[model samples]
Target: APVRSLNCTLRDSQQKSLVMSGPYELKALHLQGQDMEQQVVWSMSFVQGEESNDKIPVALGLKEKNLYLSCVLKDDKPTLQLESVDPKNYPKKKMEKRFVWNKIEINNKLEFESAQFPNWYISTSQAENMPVFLGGTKGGQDITDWTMQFVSS
Candidate 1:
């Protein structure tokens, strides 16, 4: 079997009066497979600038499992929203709008490094939402593709 692949895209949806215009799209890839009869696994990663390693749960087949992501510009800073995350998990540290980096990654484990603090992370192991984990010898199978678009003003 071949490694499963999932394709994803991001777009800008800021309003015109919000100081941004037009639409843009960013594409990403994801992988999914069955690790067990009741469990599946999926993973993706994104990196930008000096800061790298931001990961999130893209899709979960498990019931009641939801993943929502929102991008907003406030106080001249871009903020990412993780609906599935606990607010208490976020640090109170101030973020600099300049020279910022954005990325996403997902897998069986939650990984964080001191060099990449204040980033977003999400995961799920529920039977319904669990991604299918491919076997080591399977090499890569059951690929899924995704695309999203956003418009600003």
Candidate 2:
């Protein structure tokens, strides 16, 4: 499959942009005192799936790092994680599902439902600089809604 070069920003309702902190953990934090040029940008690309192709599954990663987002079990629950892997060595066959997310448009915003955890979406905390987690369905109250702005590709 081909990787699309999408430089985008994933932001919460409070205008907090998602950033990678220690160990590549995804978090929503205010980019205060940081210039626009220094903000984090994300990259997305479609990946092939095993079961169905009707839904477009996409892989998300940091534009400035080698980390890619994946859904894996942590303490018995599906957790959103960042795995550092070379783009060329990105898992293709069996691991794609964990890295896939189905995009759903909601009120002009985008909802990223995990491919591995149906109905669970990427969410931010009510407070800033919190780890982004998989939360309840189509959020308004759960902070699962996101504003995706793509600069190119």
Candidate 3:
């Protein structure tokens, strides 16, 4: 099957912190004569500088049954925790750490878009005190890049 379209909009509560609230919608078009179940996964991270120890995984999202999803975020440095999970109908699982960044964009924006599944979570550290925008498409189709200008109160 192929993905059709995906979209997401986020709102900031203070406009100066990492905390945010929003809703994301995803749509997929199955290929002709193909029947398969798929899951959506989204991830975000941040790095300080050339030092490798500053890199961290901030957020992650995985799909649950009935279109339900869960997202995890790490509050303190060098620690990981599940921030929020939607639908609240599946067993909770902890997220493992991974190498997601090689360099950090100073005062810039980092966004990701993919055509696989629409599940994702942005870590608080990445937007600790700044506004952010995020969106994606599914099935390796056309993905829209998230921009900072799109963020609003």
Candidate 4:
């Protein structure tokens, strides 16, 4: 079934915004005790990057008994393909945005990084709020290192 308040998006080559996927479902786990809309997960496995639109550049958000976030690569590509409209056609290790290397703290500030490409991060600029394609900071610890916060749908 389709859900709400979990929309997502990213930028294209020409810097135009494209509506991407959203959480498959509104997680009731956190809502079990709260009075607010607590969307936490997808009804299915989660995909975390847009590299080649397939597996290698992708990460997993499996909420099963194992409860781990990981990615599996096969045929030199991502194995977990989620959602309908997809960008899963490229075949390379080097990817755009380093979508797989994002981060989060207890405060919900989504940070970015690159496990494959050291010292690269989602860029922080006035253009930050506009779906920045991964960027770099003046320094590793740049205070304004591009980051984001999550809110209700």
The candidate maximizing TM-score is: 2
Kindly provide the TM-score of model 4 when superposed on the true structure, using C-alpha atoms.
Answer: 0.29
User: What tens digits encode model 2's per-residue C-alpha lDDT throughout 1-153?
Assistant: 444456787787778886666776776777756444545688777666533433457788877677888888888988888887876765343346788888776676677888889888888888877888888556366687678787864
In candidate 4, residue 39 scores what lDDT?
24
What lDDT tens digits, residue by residue, belong to model 4 across residues 1-153?
211122232222223222212332111111122422222231122233543322223332222212222223446643222222223432123333322553422232333344444445434234322322233454443332322223232
Off by over 4 Å in 3: 1-24, 27-55, 60-107, 113-141, 148-153
Evaluate all candidate structures by whole-model CA lDDT and list the values in order.
0.25, 0.74, 0.27, 0.30
lDDT of 4: 0.30
Tell me how candidate 2 scores on lDDT.
Answer: 0.74
Question: What is the C-alpha local distance difference test score of candidate 3?
Answer: 0.27
C-alpha displacement of 137 in model 2, angstroms? 4.7
Runs in model 2 with CA error above 4 Å? Answer: 32-38, 49-55, 91-95, 137-140
Clashes of 1: 31
Per-residue CA lDDT of model 3 for 115-150, tens digit only, reads 121233222222233223222222232322222322
> What's the CA error at residue 66 for candidate 4, in Å?
26
Give the higher-TM-score candidate: 2 or 3.
2
lDDT of 4 at 103: 40
| TM-scores for the candidates | 0.19, 0.81, 0.21, 0.29
User: Who wins the lDDT comparison?
Assistant: 2
Ranking by TM-score: 2, 4, 3, 1
Residues 1-153 of candidate 1 have per-residue lDDT tens digits of 122223322211110011111122111222234422222122222322344345332221112223223344455544333234343432112222221223333342222211222432221112232322211121123222122322221
